[PDB]
């Protein structure tokens, strides 16, 4: 139920964090 | 329920973090 | 519940991290 | 309990990331 | 549980990222 | 389950990022 939904939203947030960190690493290369 | 609510609040915090990381990447590229 | 309270405390800390990341982004833009 | 512990460790990692980004931004302005 | 294990693996990865960012900061300052 | 699998895949991606950041750091120093 909403526990599984809460964990799926956490996973989505972590995926978006990962993608921001990728963008940061790209920016630091040039 | 309050476990689900706490998990969704964490997810909200993670998504806010992802927004800040993306903005940092934007700032590195510009 | 103590677990729900702990999860809300985590969420509070994450939101504080988010604000600091937005500060870093603002400083990179000027 | 184990899920909350994982989330607290994630929050610690994100706090460390934010510190490293602030130090990077200072170094890029220097 | 495997969800807690995945969250702890993400925390380890985030801490590794934090160390690389700090090394980048140190390299810009030195 | 699918949540655990997705989290493990995120963790794999974070290791890739860490190793890009290592390359950057060593290129400065």
Residue numbers in the entry:
A (entry chain C), B (entry chain B), C (entry chain A), D (entry chain F), E (entry chain E): 1 to 30
F (entry chain D): 1 to 29
Direct quotes from the study:
Whereas, the Gly@g variant with a = Leu, d = Ile had the beginnings of a thermal unfolding curve consistent with the anticipated destabilizing effect of Gly on α-helical structures. The Gly@g peptide with a = Leu, d = Ile crystallized in two forms. Although there are natural nonameric protein assemblies, this is the first stand-alone, water-soluble α-helical CC of this size. The second crystal form revealed a collapsed C2-symmetric 6-helix bundle. We posit that the small size of Gly relaxes this design rule allowing access to other nearby regions of the CC free-energy landscape. The first challenge is incorporating multistate design into αHBs, i.e. considering multiple conformations and/or assemblies that may become accessible in the CC free-energy landscape. However, this becomes difficult with increasing off-target states, e.g. collapsed and anti-parallel structures.
